[PDB]
A paper describes a structure:
Nucleoside 2′-deoxyribosyltransferase (dNDT) enzymes catalyze transglycosylation via a covalent 2′-deoxyribosylated enzyme intermediate with retention of configuration, having applications in the biocatalytic synthesis of 2′-deoxynucleoside analogues in a single step. As with other NDT enzymes, the active site of CtNDT is formed by residues from two monomers, and therefore, it is only fully formed in the dimer/tetramer.
Enzymes evolved to bind tightly to their cognate transition state and therefore to stable compounds that most closely mimic the charge distribution and geometry of that transition state. The structure of bound ImmH largely resembles that of the clofarabine-bound complex, in agreement with the relatively weak binding of ImmH to CtNDT, and it is therefore substrate-like. ΔG was −5.60 ± 0.08 for ImmH and −11.05 ± 0.42 kcal mol–1 for DADmeH; therefore, binding is determined by an enthalpic contribution. Although no signal change was observed with DADmeH, ImmH binding led to a small fluorescence decrease in a single transient. Computational studies proposed the formation of an oxocarbenium ion in the transition state for the reaction, and D62 is equivalent to a residue proposed to interact with the anomeric carbon in this putative oxocarbenium ion transition state. CtNDTD62N, however, retained ∼50% catalytic efficiency in comparison to WT, and it is unlikely to play such a crucial role in transition-state stabilization.
Numbering used by the authors:
A (entry chain A), B (entry chain B): 2 to 155
Write the structure that this text describes.
């Protein structure tokens, strides 16, 4: 019954960011009643001693995106992380709900409407796309933004 | 008397990174007795910079690298931050002490010795550069690593 969010981020690659940045974002999402699939935590059942572990991780994440209800993509950085971008593209083509997170104040875009490369927004509505665009962790729980509307049927 | 470290990083660009990742690194360096120059706070670079102010910021950082004793460069990301790289090149050419920090486990290099672009190591010794290369915040206080040895004369 709980909506499922795939929490796509590059924060698992750095010891500090995985330890400090991810838990507050997971907590905010769970506070909304969302079930959070965080792929760095989810893929620790893989045998990383066997040579094929990379393929198995790839397919597990592909399946998690097919089975989630929405993606919450941390698109910090210049540019955003390539694996997050692949996962985001998967979610767009599978008609998943799309939520984007960027608290990076640098401006790196190819157009004047959106704050990043326009293809990151291809799965969002023409009107109101910014309602799915989160620029601070405290904003995740805002009743005026899309995550909350999604959860309240509005 | 206190040695001066320029803490170069991209962590001031993100609100969560600025608030959560930087203070533990600053206090680890200060715990060794280092005067830490953290440019985002020092040069008040807290948002996007205006039409009369960005040249002064660049000059302040250039003078800070000229006046420091060493640089502590956070070279996480793929690739490392371009401004951190500019500041690092300044410190290399000015024969400053060089310390590098990367807790990102991803390999992204053009060579087999170094985990990053070989130019980042041009101010480090040929043999034993790993003593200046920190891969965890826990490691900063290590008496077997180059920062401590630098302060105590080995
Ligand atoms: O080594 C890995 N372990 C777990 N997940 C990933 C990923 C996936 N891609 C995303 C970032 O590259 C991340 O959110 C995760 O879903 C790439 N590499 C790894």
């Amino acid at each position: 019954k709980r909506k499922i969010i795939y929490l796509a981020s590059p924060y698992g690659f750095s010891q500090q960011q995985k330890t400090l940045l991810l838990p507050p974002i997971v907590r905010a999402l769970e506070a909304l009643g969302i079930e959070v699939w965080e792929p760095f935590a989810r893929n620790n059942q893989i045998d990383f001693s066997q040579a094929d572990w990379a393929y198995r991780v790839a397919q597990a994440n592909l399946q998690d995106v097919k089975n989630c209800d929405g993606i919450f993509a941390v698109v910090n950085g210049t540019p955003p992380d390539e694996g997050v971008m692949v996962e985001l593209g998967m979610a767009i083509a599978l008609n998943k709900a799309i939520f984007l997170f960027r608290d990076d104040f640098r401006r790196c875009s190819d157009n004047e409407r959106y704050p990043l490369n326009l293809m990151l927004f291809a799965g969002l509505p023409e009107i109101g796309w910014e309602n799915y665009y989160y620029t601070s962790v405290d904003e995740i729980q805002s009743h005026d933004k899309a995550l909350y509307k999604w959860l309240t049927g509005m």
